[PDB]
Symmetry: C3
């Protein structure tokens, strides 16, 4: 009956991204040290998890969105979100 | 029917913090390389997620606790837990 | 009615591990920069969370699997998964 969140962060400011799944809809709230705002991420899912890493000063993000037994990976690589190649025989 | 956990860690020992939401109550078990113990975190929530970063050797933690459509951020910055400024129009 | 995932990553390639709990069974899909494959992790749980850290170039992983009010820690330290010492009075 409650929403579910995943979070990642990078740097020392830091930057934060919080993802929230809500009735099959996943949104993103972001923080970069000046204020909270709403991010470009809007994707279907009943559950979400996230991890992130830095390549120099480039941020790369992977969000794992799941409806039922199917799980989809979304990749941020600085040029808008794109679908990843993840798979599973759940 | 089961409890839900989130975890973060830092350093090389390392330090670990595991957060558990249980019937709207969120507790914290901690590890610093000598034994598991119970942490100062005790907050209302049906769901939890966490991220953390280091500023030199200072640890900063952000825990995201959710009941229903409302989500609250708690900040550790070395001086006890305090409420953060996170928001969302869920 | 949906599966639940947790994710961690390390390095710059990077390496990714995605954990999925599905009807009390937790599996692992892995990525090391050449393709997605299925990992050695197969453990009972209705919920999962993960964190990881590096000691030089050695990866250490901690997965937190939960059925009901009981929560179990599994440790990867380069020599196969082993049970950890975590505890809680949930
Ligand atoms: O497209 C980006 C990608 O190749 O990055 C590495 C892994 O996250 C893959 O699942 C993903 O498809
Ligand atoms: O008070 C600490 C704070 O400013 O830190 C950065 C963000 O986590 C904010 O949501 C939070 O309120
Ligand atoms: O056996 C490995 C271990 O000691 O590593 C540190 C902590 O994760 C403990 O819970 C765990 O048992």
């Amino acid at each position: 009956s409650s929403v579910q969140t995943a979070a990642t962060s990078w740097g020392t400011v830091p930057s934060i991204r919080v993802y929230t799944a809500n009735n099959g809809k996943i949104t993103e709230r972001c923080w970069n040290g000046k204020g909270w705002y709403t991010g470009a991420f809007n994707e279907p899912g009943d559950n979400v998890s996230v991890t992130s890493w830095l390549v120099g000063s480039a941020i790369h993000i992977r969000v794992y969105a799941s409806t039922g037994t199917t799980t989809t990976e979304w990749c941020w690589d600085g040029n808008g979100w794109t679908k990843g190649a993840y798979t599973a025989t759940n």
